[PDB]
């Protein structure tokens, strides 16, 4: 059996907690992989589920890739149509999100006096890796909301239209284990920090085979990363009424 189990936890401001996402393979071919992509988690105060689906087509040197999901919020019962593109090489992923809310304006979760519902918008994700020395990468995003006032950074200081920009780097020293920090910065300039722990457990793989820094170099690589979770944000950010 191939595919993957992650879980994540993140802490450091707003978007504090944890969560788990599996990655199912139900066609595999060297050409094609078809995958379902489940998973839940609890952050910012709000349990949350996701629901998806997409296919990767690989060239030895490329792969390119979509994908469809659904994300619920169950804390304020919020729901949002996700769409995502990728465009993978060795040590290197990009990848393209678009968020598109399902669910209208309704009382707030957790503003007193406020309407919620979600924040339309996309982002663009890169990650890359040290081709010499695999287990340190980078981490670049950017992402762009919608909405007179929009929590992108917390629901205490609302903005028009936000955006915003991430720097983070990682550090895996075996295949099992992912840590990093995340610097971002946007729109009234706003600032945070996200350090964050994954643990990484994949289906195809013996258990020395994911303890060992040897292998860190060939999850890295494109067929070694074909399994890899989808690169979004599975968080629904929220704009307010
Ligand atoms: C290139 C080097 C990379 C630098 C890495 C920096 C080193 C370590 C970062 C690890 C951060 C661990 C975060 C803890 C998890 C957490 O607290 O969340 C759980 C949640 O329930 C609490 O809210
Ligand atoms: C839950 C989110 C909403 C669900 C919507 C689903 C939308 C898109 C999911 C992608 C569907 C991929 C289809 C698989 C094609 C395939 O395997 O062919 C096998 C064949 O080649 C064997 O010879
Ligand atoms: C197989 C290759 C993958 C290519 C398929 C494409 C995959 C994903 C594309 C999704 C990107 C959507 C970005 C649009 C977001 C947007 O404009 O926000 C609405 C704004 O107007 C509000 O006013
Ligand atoms: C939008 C609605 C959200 C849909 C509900 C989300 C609920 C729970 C998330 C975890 C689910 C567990 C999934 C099963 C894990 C699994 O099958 O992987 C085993 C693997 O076979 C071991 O090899």
Known sequence: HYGTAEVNLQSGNNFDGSSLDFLLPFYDSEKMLAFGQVGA??????????????????????????????????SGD????????????????????????????????????????????????????????????????????????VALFNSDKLQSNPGAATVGVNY??????????????????????????????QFDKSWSQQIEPQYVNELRTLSGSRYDLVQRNNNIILEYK
Do not use: C
């Open 41 to 74: 988690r609890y952050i910012d105060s709000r349990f949350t589920a996701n629901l998806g689906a997409g296919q990767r087509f690989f060239l030895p040197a490329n792969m390119l890739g979509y994908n469809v999901f659904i994300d619920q919020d169950f």
């Open 78 to 149: 919020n729901t949002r149509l996700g769409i995502g593109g990728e465009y993978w090489r060795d040590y290197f992923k990009s990848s393209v999100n678009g968020y598109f809310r399902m669910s209208g304006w309704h009382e707030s979760y957790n503003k007193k006096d406020y309407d919620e519902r979600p924040a339309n918008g996309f982002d663009i994700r890169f990650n890359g890796y040290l081709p010499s020395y695999p287990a340190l990468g980078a981490k670049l995003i950017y992402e762009q909301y919608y909405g007179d006032n």
């Open 172 to 201: 895996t020293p075996i295949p099992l284990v992912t840590m990093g920090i995340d610097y971002r910065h946007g729109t009234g300039n706003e600032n945070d920090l996200l350090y964050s722990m994954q643990f990484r457990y």
